[PDB]
Structures are given as structure tokens and as C-alpha cells.
Amino acid sequence: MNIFEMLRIDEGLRLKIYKDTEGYYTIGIGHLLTKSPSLNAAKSELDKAIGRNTNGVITKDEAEKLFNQDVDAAVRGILRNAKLKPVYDSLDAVRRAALINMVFQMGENGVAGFTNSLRMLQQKRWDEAAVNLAKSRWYNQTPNRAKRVITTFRTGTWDAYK
Numbered sequence: 141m142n143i144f145e146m147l148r149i150d151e152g153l154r155l156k157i158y159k160d161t162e163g164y165y166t167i168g169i170g171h172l173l174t175k176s177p178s179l180n181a182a183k184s185e186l187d188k189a190i191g192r193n194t195n196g197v198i199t200k201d202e203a204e205k206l207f208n209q210d211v212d213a214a215v216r217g218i219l220r221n222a223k224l225k226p227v228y229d230s231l232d233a234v235r236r237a238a239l240i241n242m243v244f245q246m247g248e249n250g251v252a253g254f255t256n257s258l259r260m261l262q263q264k265r266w267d268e269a270a271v272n273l274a275k276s277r278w279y280n281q282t283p284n285r286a287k288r289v290i291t292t293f294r295t296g297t298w299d300a301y302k
């Protein structure tokens with residue numbers, strides 16, 4: 141198991157524009173297109189992202205390409221972030237995957253806001269961190285996925301994904 145397989149399990153793969161859990165236009169492996177309600181604003185972003193007229197449909201390869209960019213950007217955003225970098229540096233390899241997963245789902249700003257949990261993670265207070273991470277809109281809105289990520293932080297193994 142690695143970050144790619146992990147996020148592939150959490151996000152799924154869809155080759156046609158769809159609506160995410162929040163109701164936003166997305167495609168592929170969790171690639172957010174726009175927060176705008178317009179399907180046309182979505183098709184426009186989609187074509188700009190792929191470099192071809194897609195008519196809202198892409199191939200597996202195209203989807204994986206987007207996914208490769210998104211993970212890369214997630215990591216790089218963590219490394220450039222003053223609040224995130226120190227947490228990431230402190231973690232072991234599995235727990236690092238858990239943080240990258242939160243960032244991919246919610247963006248750097250979103251994660252950087254989990255001040256208290258971040259502090260607990262850095263201090264390696266696993267059980268306490270898991271408890272605080274659960275008191276969030278995140279956990280309430282997508283409980284199955286949140287539980288998987290939280291378990292990864294608590295244990296430091298890939299159990300929840302096996």
C-alpha cells in the first residue's frame with residue numbers, strides 16, 4: 141500500500157463529470173473541477189485541464205495523469221506550508237500518507253486549520269490526536285473515510301485499508 145493506492149480506494153475513479161459529496165463538479169480520481177454550479181463552467185475547466193475538447197468525458201490515462209499531478213501538488217503544498225512541514229517532517233512514512241490524504245481532500249488551508257490535532261501528531265500522542273480529529277465537520281460529513289485516515293494516524297499501519 142502507498143499513497144496512490146490509498147487515495148484510489150478513498151476517491152474511486154469516474155470517467156464522466158460527477159458531483160462529489162459536497163455537490164461539486166469533479167472527475168477522475170477526486171479531481172475537483174469547480175465549485176461553480178454551472179456544468180458548463182465544469183466542462184470548460186475540464187478541457188483547459190486536459191488540453192482537448194472533452195465533452196465531459198476523459199480516458200483512464202487522462203484521469204491518472206491528473207491524479208499524478210494532484211498528489212505531487214499535495215506533497216509540495218505540505219512542504220511549502222509553515223504549519224504543515226514540521227508535522228510532516230516529524231512523521232513516519234505511513235502517517236505521512238495519512239496527512240497527504242487529508243490535504244488532497246481538503247486543501248492545505250483546511251488542514252493547516254486543525255491546529256490542536258497537528259500539535260498532538262507532532263508530539264506523537266496518537267490516541268489523543270485520533271480523538272480530537274473526530275470532532276470536526278470532516279468526520280461528521282464523511283465518517284467512513286475519516287475513520288480510515290484516523291486509524292492510520294492512530295496505529296501507523298495500513299490496516300484500515302486492508
Ligand SMILES: [Cl-]
Pocket residue numbers: 189
Ligand atoms: Cl489542473
Ligand SMILES: [Cl-]
Pocket residue numbers: 281282283284285286
Ligand atoms: Cl465516508
